[PDB]
Write a protein that binds this ligand. Sequence first.
Ligand SMILES: Cc1cn([C@H]2C[C@H](OP(=O)(O)O)[C@@H](COP(=O)(O)O)O2)c(=O)[nH]c1=O
Length: 129
Amino acid sequence: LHKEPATLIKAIDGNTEKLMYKGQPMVFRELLVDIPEFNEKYGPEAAAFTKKMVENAKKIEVEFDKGQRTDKYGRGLAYIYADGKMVNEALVRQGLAKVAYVYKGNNTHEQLLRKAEAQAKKEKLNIWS
Ligand SMILES: Cc1cn([C@H]2C[C@H](OP(=O)(O)O)[C@@H](COP(=O)(O)O)O2)c(=O)[nH]c1=O
């Protein structure tokens, strides 16, 4: 796998809906996680943690896995990094997302993320409280 550059695109409301990848706006869906929606418990917290992590970062990178790069809704499927720290792993490690959607061939970081989830669960953090 290899990391590639992207930048945040700031939406009219001040948040990031899309990343600019090879100079095109794209919604990216994080690989291997289920993140609660805003209306669900921990949803506001997951969103706020993501916003701080990506906005504070000097460098955003995306990393496609070995399988499908876009899903059925046209979203890019990747691991997202903020100054070299994976956003997908960080949400899981904080109990702000669960490991999920593990499909054949896009599963490279599965064990790493399950390791993070077990720690968040052992620590009874957030979703696991
Ligand atoms: C994470 C991921 C989601 N998806 C699709 C599966 C779900 O389809 P369905 O909408 O039919 O349930 C949807 C979940 O995304 P969200 O959790 O963003 O809603 O995204 C993929 O196809 N590949 C993936 O790797």
